Design a protein around this ligand. Structure first.
Ligand SMILES: Cc1ncc(COP(=O)(O)O)c(C=O)c1O
Ligand SMILES: Cc1ncc(COP(=O)(O)O)c(C=O)c1O
Ligand SMILES: [Cl-]
Lengths: 350, 353
């Protein structure tokens, strides 16, 4: 047989893909909670392997989410949850994933990296689901991802449309509700629907309202039968002991109350930032959000984005996303950080 | 109308969730079954930035590990253990259903587990009677192989793979496959590392871990050393944020010059304890043979090993059974622990009389 270079020994999809890629003082670009919550290690056992699925973390998250412990898996962020679902259910080259742009980019990245076709069905003008469009495109789909509330547009997906989607996929595909932002609108969660839908899965994270993006700790909620499949494909030791230690501390009753106050702070600050933005000459529209970010369409958005960037105010450009021409996504930070944004947009004179 | 398990990939249905038989601490079990350093080294966090995403590849960890390993920073990737290094290599280079991995039993099980989970053929080439490589056997089985894993020193048998045989294997695979030297245990015999060979073999990769001599299994922190071309392929398939900030913080602490010196002292402790345990083991009626090792474990063939394993297990002394491994019938793998743990093992084996 003939020899190949390192780059040609790599899988064809790996050679072709573009991987996800990531200076100033105001960072409002990644939906992080704006201030650190300090935690110290309480378990000096680092010479020993951790538990594969740390019981205190699983049980505390299950109590918080009001599900059974056997309905909970813990992983390296909701990002790993996405990977596990495609790894378990999608035969590379034969099965597809489906998602609905404009939305979170890692469904596509994980699928393309694993070797699984992406089906895309743009949402409607209000970013609600195109159920007929999904129906037409479901052949060969094994996993459907729906972000609700959606990143980057901010709105909750209509609950009955999710039931309609779940009936459309019953016996055919897993439906994944990505609830990375559900702490900001907790009454909207679908985690209470597991008994109706054997194929429903919910992703959760500590990265956002819980203010622990640095831990890389996320959860998959599903019926036990789905959890048991995902535990067949997960790494033996996916959570380090320091992360398990801090996660358990964060998920105590005291930790939960603290998170709920973090959410209240963000909701109050979002109300302030939205009202201020709507008065700024370069802001064309601010879209209502149920999260810790708001999408704003801005006149000359690329010049404004670069202008704030050069001033050290780092937003998230969404101008290339389907339907989002002119839109920047602004995370809700501190009042001082909101005021930096307000003052810089006001100074843009466009 | 398919049930949940029927929607899963066919290969996934036959997998088994990872089974840890390990009870809580506080039952007093003696854990000599996972090649862990036997006592904790304490670290505290120094960086309270947990609201922010970590660095994708923490610079201080990468550059510290590169200094330690005497390679360039562009030749280093950090992952969730060497386990994730194994996964990335198969994920980058093995097309499921088309390409194969190759390894040489009896050896570490996760090469097979990762390949079977991803859906990549496992090609096996059992080693020779002394557990050295069967190079003719490998050459006959290399068609379609994209990644070869060789554990040196080997787990569970403990010996270093002959360096000339690794050069021969590298020439055999040039242009055809990646060769991965799994160096999880290389700190116990650091002169045997192949990390200095990168400039001679574009397709050589070395896996390292903090889980063993570095006494930081709980961190889930490992490293892949390779030429930059290989690192850059692997970085296309790694998760965007694979290392948490607490792990990066502690890892950088552990890889300081003082941390390296402390690790060397841990190795010296294990080497001295291994000499004691081996000498005592060879004097015990039920021990048939103890195989020389260059690691923090020894493989011992034991008369009625299954009954002895169960006897010690029921006493709370936890070894690693290897009786079902090719060529290893009768063999238990015994991690080197503290002196008092060695003495628990010695005393229990002596009482099997
Ligand atoms: C919609 C959504 N899901 C998941 C994630 C990833 O979450 P994690 O930090 O738990 O990996 C993000 C990160 O920004 C996100 O926006
Ligand atoms: C040969 C070998 N390689 C790799 C590993 C996994 O190491 P890590 O803890 O870095 O994932 C082990 C663990 O025992 C091992 O024995
Ligand atoms: Cl189309």
């Amino acid at each position: 047989h003939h020899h190949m270079s390192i780059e040609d020994l790599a899988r064809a999809n790996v050679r072709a893909l573009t991987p996800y890629q990531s200076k100033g003082d105001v960072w409002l670009n990644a939906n992080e909670f704006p201030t650190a919550v300090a935690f110290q290690l309480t378990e000096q056992t680092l010479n020993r392997y951790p538990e594969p699925q740390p019981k205190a973390v699983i049980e505390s998250y299950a109590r918080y989410a009001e599900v059974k412990p056997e309905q909970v898996l813990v992983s390296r962020g909701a990002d790993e949850g996405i990977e596990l679902l495609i790894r378990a259910f999608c035969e590379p080259g034969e099965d597809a994933v489906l998602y609905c742009p404009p939305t979170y980019g890692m469904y596509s990245v994980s699928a393309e990296t694993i070797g699984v076709e992406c089906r895309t069905v743009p949402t409607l003008a209000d970013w609600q689901l195109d159920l007929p469009g999904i129906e037409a495109r479901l052949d060969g789909v094994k996993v459907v991802f729906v972000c609700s509330p959606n990143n980057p547009t901010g709105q909750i997906i209509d609950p009955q449309s999710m039931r309609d989607l779940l009936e459309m996929t019953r016996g055919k595909a897993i439906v994944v509700a990505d609830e990375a932002y559900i702490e900001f609108c907790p009454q909207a969660t679908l985690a209470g629907w597991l008994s109706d839908y054997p194929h429903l899965v919910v992703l959760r994270t500590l990265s956002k309202a819980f203010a622990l993006a640095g831990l890389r700790c996320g959860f998959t909620l599903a019926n036990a039968e789905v959890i048991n499949v995902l535990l067949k494909v997960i790494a033996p030791y996916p959570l380090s002991t320091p992360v398990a230690d801090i996660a358990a501390q964060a998920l105590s009753p005291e930790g939960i109350a603290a998170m709920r106050q973090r959410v209240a702070q963000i909701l109050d600050e979002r109300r302030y930032l939205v009202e201020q933005l709507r008065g700024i000459a370069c802001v064309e529209q601010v879209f209502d959000s149920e999260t810790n970010y708001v999408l704003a369409r801005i006149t000359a958005s690329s010049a404004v984005f670069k202008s704030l960037w050069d001033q050290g105010i780092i937003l998230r450009d969404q101008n290339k996303q389907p339907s989002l021409s002119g839109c920047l996504r602004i995370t809700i930070g501190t009042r001082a950080e909101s005021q930096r944004v307000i003052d810089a947009l006001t100074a843009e004179n466009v």
